Amino acid sequence: VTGWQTIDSKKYYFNTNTAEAATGWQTIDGKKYYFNTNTAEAATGWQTIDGKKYYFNTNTSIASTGYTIINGKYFYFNTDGIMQIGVFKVPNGFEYFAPANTHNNNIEGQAILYQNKFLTLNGKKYYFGSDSKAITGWQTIDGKKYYFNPNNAIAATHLCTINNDKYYFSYDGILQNGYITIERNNFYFDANNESKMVTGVFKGPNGFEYFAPANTHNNNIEGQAIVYQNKFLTLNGKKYYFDNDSKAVTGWQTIDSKKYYFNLNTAVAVTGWQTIDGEKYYFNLNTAE
Amino acid sequence: PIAGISAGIPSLVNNELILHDKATSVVNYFNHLSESKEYGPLKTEDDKILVPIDDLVISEIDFNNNSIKLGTCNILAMEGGSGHTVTGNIDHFFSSPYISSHIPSLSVYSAIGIKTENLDFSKKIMMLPNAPSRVFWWETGAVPGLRSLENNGTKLLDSIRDLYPGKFYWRFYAFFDYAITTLKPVYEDTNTKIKLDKDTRNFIMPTITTDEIRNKLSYSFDGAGGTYSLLLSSYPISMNINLSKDDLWIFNIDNEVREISIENGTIKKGNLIEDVLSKIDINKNKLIIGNQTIDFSGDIDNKDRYIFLTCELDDKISLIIEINLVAKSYSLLLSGDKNYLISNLSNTIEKINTLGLDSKNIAYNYTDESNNKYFGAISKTSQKSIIHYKKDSKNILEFYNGSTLEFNSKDFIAEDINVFMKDDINTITGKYYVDNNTDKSIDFSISLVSKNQVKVNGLYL
User: Fold this and answer.
1) Mind telling me how many Å the CA of B430 is from chain A's nearest CA?
2) Which among A114, A117, A115, A125 has a CA at the least distance from the CA of A155?
3) Where does this polypeptide localize (chain A) (predicted)?
4) Residues 6 or more apart from B223 whose CB is under 8 A from it?
5) Which residues of B touch A (CB under 8 A)?
6) Element (H, E) at A165
7) Angstroms from A134 CA to nearest CA on chain B
């Protein structure tokens, strides 16, 4: 009986030429049929093989599907067919599969009703709410600002580019906002518009600094703080002037033998009628002085 | 795994080496160099080998006293900060303490808590330390929101901070969240003294990719009475072998003769480099093999010294280069099963020719599982071979041409058998007894030539 036998209550298969019951692993029809070592017992549903666990279709057929329903059990099979214990995407979302002793004393691989909680495998952070599926995107658990990658539901935990909108996430994954140090360069991810990588001039640990755009000074990076050795710039609408070092100034200062002023809160050029503890001086609309 | 996988492989940024760029990568480096308070300086892997914590500098390995001594994972210090406070393991500051390379440095091998003395060097396979002495210029960036990270690395950093109550505030609050960001190491020249015991020890030379790490680390094995081995790495490291009296030195040159490939942080051996062993420096003071210069300083005057270099030509055949340093000479041995060796002798010979060894004759000294000793010789040219052995008090000799048996005597009736080959010709010298008479003794020297034909070179009556 070369090829497919009459099952004989054991789903027997034989070699096409050798006519032998090839126990072990065999790729019939491009599949992963495991024939039991006893004689040829083949599929027995559950089948632990060298530690690797496989569930087989009782009605003969094949066992490599993923997202398979078996007597109320939903299990994931990878390309080869080994059972996994991770969080994997079914067409209904990123479902989490847990060991036996997690919840309800289930069987290893059950889609546990894990909701409204965080979870991790190897530092890879996921969160579940309502349905037991990932909510990949921007999330605000307890007022935080987590971001889970839609590709893999894994929370971003570093400098991540989203819609050309680079953000910084800590080791946990929370969106960090303010003055940050990436490698040895200094960046500002301002929280005013929910923590974008800004390229303006904002407060730092040692005074206001110019987070310049690309190639503004040497081959710098976008939003990177640069040394601005006592120069003149005006990005758009507001003039800016710093000290000898890159740090800015917020007080009565002179540049070209012209008296100048900058706001106490922010180091912005004082233009328009602005009375400063006395005479207004008519800070000019342009090149104020 | 190749050196630096668990801890980090430094990269040459600008003109300085930096192994870790992120704040949490540095904490992970300390976490990796915090296992020694739980696994010890040496951790057991595969139940067969001892491996040191990766990038943990070890200066002394005293096998005799079962003791270890570490080098200097020394890290710089700070000075400053007014109104310092500690709340929730977080250092709140009024000023900003700054790194200083002009003050005494702070050692992590005083708060890590190494069990240096009385360790278990029972397993006879060991991996050599892959870390020279290091000094760490670390820069504290303004990374925010790391005042919740609780690993073993943060425990080690807190211990270092606690042990130096005035300096090394690893993560602080200079009105902003500040923490370690970079680790820039320089490597002082390091010499590791491994004091060999009277037992047999086997060493694995780590493969360090960064040449600046490799050129600043050296090994020094003080010899004793025993047999010791060493797995040479394809990336050479300076070594100083102290030749003792009547000791056996083995240098596995598997990585030094095979195409090395690095993937997944692991070494894979490929094809043999052509003419890798074509010219071997066999000077009586040092041995340069293909790129590795072993320094032999000590009892280098021993005229009976023999070092051995082992390379696995096949899964079963092993090639052993037996070298005498004082004579600056080398010879080849081709162990393995005699049936398997004869079946594919041509592949072995072409592999040896690819290696570049010019030894025209090879010896054969197999010892199987059931204490059967198959001695013999192989000619590099013409691929002839003689295999003599004993089975059930019977002397069997087999002469193979290439791979076909052209002679076989299953009962060689003669005592004191000794075979040797001149170039391609082979000769067996023995003591036949005439008609099983101990008084009638005839010494013979014979040459086996094809089927049922033996050339009698000499007789003595």
Assistant:
1) 53
2) A125
3) Host cell membrane; Host cytoplasm, Host cytosol; Host endosome membrane; Secreted
4) B196, B241, B242, B243, B244, B245, B247, B249, B298, B299
5) 21-22, 24, 96, 139, 141-146, 148-149, 174-176, 178, 181-182
6) none
7) 24
